[PDB]
Amino acid sequence: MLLWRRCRAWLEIRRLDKELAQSSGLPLELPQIVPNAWNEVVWRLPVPNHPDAFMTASNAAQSDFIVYVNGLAFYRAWLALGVEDSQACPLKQDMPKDRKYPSSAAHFAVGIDSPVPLADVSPTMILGHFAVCFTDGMTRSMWLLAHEVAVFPVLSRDEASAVMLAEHVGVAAPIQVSKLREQCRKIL
Ligand code: AUC
């Protein structure tokens, strides 16, 4: 029921608040941009006690922006959507119960040969507070979070939205997809 879910979500957010407080200003494991047998931005993501995951900005528009997000912070902002929204975030413990989760785990298993495209997310406002919502990529985000990936990239529609995401959940300034692609080519 509803009070049940609200109280659960409240307690998880409080947990996240503490964790973020403890780990404030400590170094996190970053995605690693890798050289690739294609013409795309690809990252190696370390996954604790698990084989590496690989993701790609292949399905991004040149106009999109990349934001590298603190997983815990991203998770907390997702919970801010509340519990009734169709995009409501399951508690981490229940994420593997999600219907598409096995299909996502399957995709993440392939590796560098078929990297998983990024999620497309947006900053929004819910009952007067900041939250994150999705255009796509909720399940793969759950996989990442349930597997405790510390930092991962996400896609945002435009500069201001990406700056807003980075402000609340980012570990770095946003960078435009077109400009990152260019730099990857000039360096990697
Ligand atoms: N391609 C592709 Au996929 C998830 N989760």
Swiss-Prot record:
Keywords recorded for this protein, A-Z: Plasmid
InterPro entries hit by this protein: FiwA/Osa (IPR035615), PFIN (IPR054044)
Matches recorded under CDD domains: FIN
Cytoplasm listed as a keyword: no
Origin superkingdom: Bacteria
Function per UniProt: Suppression of A.tumefaciens oncogenicity.
Name of the molecule in the record: Protein osa
Organism for this UniProt entry: Shigella flexneri
